[PDB]
């Protein structure tokens, strides 16, 4: 008779060598590892956007409560949590009038409006970065809702064309942080945050500190010389332009640092054959990028390299992978998917499965219940009934419990959101964003490898 094995909740390190489980409570208790002295925030938008940013940046100075701290922990304050400085003064500001917007809105091509508005914001940001002397570490962009309701993605090509100058920025909607007076015709806020102000403050603060340059939290258990290569398989889709395979890759080596290199556009196997079997040259180029960057950042050769993807791996690609890697090291490829259905229902009570349960069907294939009820939060992250992920290793000698606990540890390193956990591992989560940003503009040849310029 078959049972389900359990994987313990992994720990995340904090300040002074301390470990917790929930990053929100640990942030309220200990604080970040490496400290930054402060950040000067810049805003581009109308005067309404400036006053709304000032009223929030203020509001977030004061402590904000939720209904309870069991699921939605309180916000002690920016300086109390992170130990940095944030104010309403020394804020640079670039304004936009409504004459040009009204005059150009009456055109026939929506894409022309997207182009010229994004270039308006881009050249204002670039000119401020190249003529003004006050240092700006983060640029916060406020968008009016008229262009959202009357006029492919904005921030996608915004970050893509800002990527050649290496400037971090974040996009803030007008209804996000001014929801008090943004209601529909009926009379209720459709973006209602009447209880959720703590989550909004937590997410904004964590994103701002990540774009600041500081490291909020990392993971502890790292054996000497192990690298996880989360291989992007997001498909570029730009019509008759030959998309083929624009695979990218992440790697996590010694901290939460994500050093993502540009995979080749890959003229092999135009999408009539999308089985994604990499030819030796491009495969060894990708592996050589990963290995050389590991050599640069750690000076020692990797003992074992893990590969995360979403499709199956065949023999010629693996033999191409193996020869460049030396005789000592070991390589393993892991496939993660969501489409496989297996839903487990609970006999008594009204609660879901717990996070940490694992189901093994063989040495190669297994399951893992990432989402569900969490004892610490005393709730579940998922909605309705959680859906697991199917994990199978193609070939390579490794322990199944090790890869299960490794993906479970990797699930908690989300930096854009201050949530307990997400379903997919954060390598595959940053996969979609890195692909969308990097294949929104072909015109870049040496993109940066950091993360603050993407999320």
């Amino acid at each position: 008779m078959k049972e389900l094995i359990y994987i313990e909740e992994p720990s995340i390190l904090f300040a002074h060598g301390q470990k917790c489980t929930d990053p929100r409570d640990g942030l309220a208790l200990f604080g970040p590892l490496n400290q930054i002295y402060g950040i000067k925030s810049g805003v581009v938008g109308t005067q309404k956007g400036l006053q709304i940013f000032k009223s929030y940046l203020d509001k977030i100075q004061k402590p904000i409560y939720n209904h309870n701290n069991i699921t939605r922990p309180m916000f002690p304050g920016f300086e109390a949590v992170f130990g940095c400085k944030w104010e309403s003064q020394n804020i640079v500001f670039k304004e936009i009038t409504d004459e040009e917007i009204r005059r150009y809105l009456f055109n026939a091509s929506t894409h022309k409006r997207t182009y010229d508005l994004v270039t308006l914001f881009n050249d204002k940001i670039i000119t401020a970065n190249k003529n003004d002397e006050e240092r700006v570490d983060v640029w916060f962009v406020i968008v009016p809702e008229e262009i959202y309701k009357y006029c492919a993605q904005f921030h996608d090509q915004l970050k893509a064309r800002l990527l050649e100058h290496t400037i971090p920025t974040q996009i803030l909607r007008e209804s996000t942080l001014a929801w008090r007076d943004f209601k529909n015709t009926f009379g209720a806020p459709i973006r209602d945050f009447s209880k959720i102000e703590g989550h909004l403050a937590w997410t904004i603060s964590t994103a701002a500190y990540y774009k600041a340059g500081g490291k909020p939290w990392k993971l502890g258990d790292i054996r000497p010389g192990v690298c996880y290569l989360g291989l992007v398989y997001k498909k570029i889709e730009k019509s008759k332009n030959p998309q083929n395979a624009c695979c990218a890759a992440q790697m996590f080596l010694d901290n939460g640092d994500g050093t993502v290199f540009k995979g080749e556009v890959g003229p092999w196997y135009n999408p009539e054959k999308g089985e994604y079997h990499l030819k030796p040259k491009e495969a060894k180029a990708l592996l050589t990028q990963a290995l050389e960057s590991y050599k640069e950042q750690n000076k020692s050769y990797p003992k074992e390299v893990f590969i995360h993807a979403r499709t199956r791996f065949n023999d010629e690609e693996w033999n191409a992978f193996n020869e460049v890697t030396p005789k000592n090291t070991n390589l393993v490829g892991v496939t993660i998917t969501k489409s496989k259905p297996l839903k487990l229902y609970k006999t008594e009570g009204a609660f879901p499965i717990m996070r940490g349960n694992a189901y093994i069907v063989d040495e190669k294939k297994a399951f893992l219940w990432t989402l569900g009820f969490v004892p610490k939060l005393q709730s579940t992250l998922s909605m309705e009934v959680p859906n697991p992920i199917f994990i199978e290793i193609n070939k390579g000698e490794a322990e199944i419990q090790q890869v299960l606990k490794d993906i479970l540890a990797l699930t908690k390193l989300n930096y854009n959101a201050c949530i307990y956990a997400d379903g997919e591992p954060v390598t595959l989560r940053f996969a979609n964003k890195i692909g969308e940003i990097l294949t929104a503009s072909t015109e870049i040849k040496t993109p940066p490898l950091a993360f603050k310029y993407y999320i």
């Binding site: 208790l29 209602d192 006999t347 009204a350 709730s379």
Partner: protein, 450 residues
């Protein structure tokens, strides 16, 4: 010798701020006495409070909140603090903390007016900074900072009802295994006895055209009633392959590979289920990739079966429940079942726009949880089972397939505790945060709902 820091406040009001201050103070080396981490239940509180106040307390910290100036207990604590600070003849004992910006300075009690309250209104970090430098100016003996003790205390007190336990808990899945499979396949080499324009889906029983052969699960005498020319067929030309060899992975011939043997098997399983439950007379829905089904209201008695709730109406809309089945034999010979709910207007016809159906499914999703889902799933499978233990299929006039109506159940080694019903409302609030973190082109279909 006195080295303890005393904090007084409203336990169920300033708990958060008091917990933050106590944990930070115990992490920065100052030993702190408070009613959160120490004063648990089951103890006599007042004698210990007085003894610690007037024996080993060197500084007193009263929270001046809106609820911190009318409760009786904080007033009594302040009275005994006034008595002990008059005994010590020291004016640096009562250190007020004011955390509510709504509280005016003229409403505060008389013993707190004379001393200037430490600010905790606009921010807390520099408030802790001035508390620390006032403490070190007042020359309180301190211990070297050791956040490890704070970690141990935080694990000890604040993680009591929020940690998993070791108990056995039983779960049942959506997987239904076949107990009985036909032993052989029947490959029919009809060749010229079939028209070229023959669509194989029109037969009463599963079949697949396969090169020069017609694979099926029934004999050659089955197709007589629809094909007059099949009466001249000889059964010796047909070939048979034992399904034990296929399912055990030991059959690999040049004719049909094992992969295609399993593919043909699962194809006949899938459309055998399709034709079987067409024979039940349960109405159909045009699903995008699979085939979806739903049961008409007015057939089941009381809209009930074994005291279970399956069909209903919420706002002038009768919603129905249904399942979709696809065979998968990769880990085990198991028939899958996936649940979908279907919305009708008058119980006969279907909504023209699929956006309305998607919106109704997502609107009615949150009102129940996996208890109701498990109940409805077992109800649908038990109804589909013309039998009591399994499902009598309809694949052959003779050979049949029997898949049990009970799903496979598994048990886990460790689980959690069962709280009250606040958690489900908080999961509804989780659905609210899922509204509040993502939205895309909702205006037109929301305007079209009325």
């Amino acid at each position: 010798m006195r080295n303890k820091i005393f904090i007084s406040h409203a336990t169920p009001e300033d708990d958060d701020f008091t917990r933050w201050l106590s944990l930070k103070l115990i992490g920065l080396g100052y030993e702190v006495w408070c009613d959160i981490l120490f004063l648990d239940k089951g103890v006599d509180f007042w004698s210990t409070i007085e003894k610690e106040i007037r024996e080993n307390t060197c500084k007193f910290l009263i929270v001046s909140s809106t609820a911190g100036n009318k409760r009786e207990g904080v007033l009594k604590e302040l009275a005994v603090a006034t008595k002990v600070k008059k005994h010590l003849q020291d004016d640096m004992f009562i250190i007020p903390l004011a955390i509510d910006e709504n509280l005016s300075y003229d409403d505060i009690n008389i013993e707190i007016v004379r001393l200037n309250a430490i600010d905790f209104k606009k921010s807390w970090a520099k408030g802790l900074q001035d508390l620390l430098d006032a403490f070190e100016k007042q020359n309180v003996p301190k211990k070297p900072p050791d956040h490890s003790k704070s970690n141990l205390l935080y694990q000890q007190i604040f993680l009591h009802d929020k940690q998993a336990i070791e108990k056995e808990e039983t779960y049942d899945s959506n997987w239904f295994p076949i107990i009985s499979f036909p032993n052989e396949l029947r490959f029919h080499r009809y060749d010229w006895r079939l028209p070229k324009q023959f669509d194989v889906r029109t037969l009463a029983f599963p079949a697949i055209r396969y090169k020069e052969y017609l694979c099926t699960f029934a004999w050659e005498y089955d197709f007589i009633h629809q094909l007059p020319k099949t009466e001249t067929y000889n059964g010796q030309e047909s070939i048979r392959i034992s399904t034990s060899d296929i399912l055990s992975g030991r059959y690999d011939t040049d004719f049909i590979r094992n992969y295609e043997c399993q593919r043909l098997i699962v194809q006949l399983i899938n459309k055998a289920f399709e034709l079987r439950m067409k024979d039940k007379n349960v109405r159909e829905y045009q699903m995008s990739k699979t085939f979806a089904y739903w049961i008409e209201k007015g057939k089941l008695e009381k809209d009930k079966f074994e005291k279970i709730k399956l069909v209903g109406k919420q706002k002038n809309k009768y919603w129905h429940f249904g399942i979709s089945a696809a065979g998968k034999l990769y880990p085990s010979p198991v028939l899958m079942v996936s649940s979908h709910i279907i919305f009708t207007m008058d119980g006969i016809n279907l909504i023209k726009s699929k956006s309305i159906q998607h919106s109704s499914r997502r609107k009615q999703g949150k009102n129940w949880w996996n208890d109701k889902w498990r109940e409805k799933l077992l109800a649908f499978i038990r109804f589909l089972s013309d039998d009591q233990n399994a499902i009598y299929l309809n694949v052959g006039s003779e050979e049949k397939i029997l898949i049990s109506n009970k799903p496979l159940k598994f048990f886990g080694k460790m689980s959690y505790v069962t709280p009250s019903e606040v958690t489900l409302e908080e999961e509804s609030v989780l659905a609210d945060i899922n509204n509040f973190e993502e939205d895309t082109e909702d205006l037109d279909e929301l305007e079209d709902i009325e």
